[PDB]
Amino acid sequence: AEIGGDHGYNATNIAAGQTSGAVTQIGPAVMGMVRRAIPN
Amino acid sequence: STTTNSNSIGRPNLVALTRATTKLIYSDIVATQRTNQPVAAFYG
């Protein structure tokens, strides 16, 4: 009967770990970083 | 008749030194653990 819950697909809510159900998140993990390329 | 009214004193003996600081008691009050991030968030 425990519903985990979704996010609002709102970048603010995702970034903040805000869900609609049983579990609040620490935050949206880590995928990585993009650094701007340097010209030749 | 040399007495203490003649003999001079170069410097006093400090004997002892102290400091006006206080006792800090928070270690026994606060539930503290070091963090490794600019933000922390506890789970209830």
PDB file of C-alpha atoms in Angstrom, chain A residues 8-30:
ATOM      1  CA  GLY A   8       6.518  17.235 -10.391  1.00  0.00           C
ATOM      2  CA  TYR A   9       8.848  17.106 -13.462  1.00  0.00           C
ATOM      3  CA  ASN A  10       9.699  20.572 -12.276  1.00  0.00           C
ATOM      4  CA  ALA A  11      13.413  21.069 -12.253  1.00  0.00           C
ATOM      5  CA  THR A  12      13.091  22.822  -8.869  1.00  0.00           C
ATOM      6  CA  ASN A  13      11.330  19.867  -7.296  1.00  0.00           C
ATOM      7  CA  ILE A  14      13.711  17.416  -8.811  1.00  0.00           C
ATOM      8  CA  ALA A  15      16.773  19.362  -7.736  1.00  0.00           C
ATOM      9  CA  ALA A  16      15.333  19.660  -4.238  1.00  0.00           C
ATOM     10  CA  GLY A  17      14.431  15.925  -3.953  1.00  0.00           C
ATOM     11  CA  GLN A  18      10.681  16.726  -3.631  1.00  0.00           C
ATOM     12  CA  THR A  19       8.382  13.766  -4.195  1.00  0.00           C
ATOM     13  CA  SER A  20       4.644  13.110  -3.893  1.00  0.00           C
ATOM     14  CA  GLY A  21       4.732   9.911  -1.792  1.00  0.00           C
ATOM     15  CA  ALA A  22       6.339   7.777   0.900  1.00  0.00           C
ATOM     16  CA  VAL A  23       9.944   8.737   0.229  1.00  0.00           C
ATOM     17  CA  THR A  24      11.764  12.084   0.057  1.00  0.00           C
ATOM     18  CA  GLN A  25      15.031  11.977  -1.887  1.00  0.00           C
ATOM     19  CA  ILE A  26      18.513  13.118  -0.902  1.00  0.00           C
ATOM     20  CA  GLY A  27      18.822  14.731  -4.330  1.00  0.00           C
ATOM     21  CA  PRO A  28      19.044  13.717  -8.042  1.00  0.00           C
ATOM     22  CA  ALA A  29      22.245  11.644  -7.755  1.00  0.00           C
ATOM     23  CA  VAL A  30      25.181  12.536 -10.009  1.00  0.00           C
TER      24      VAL A  30
END
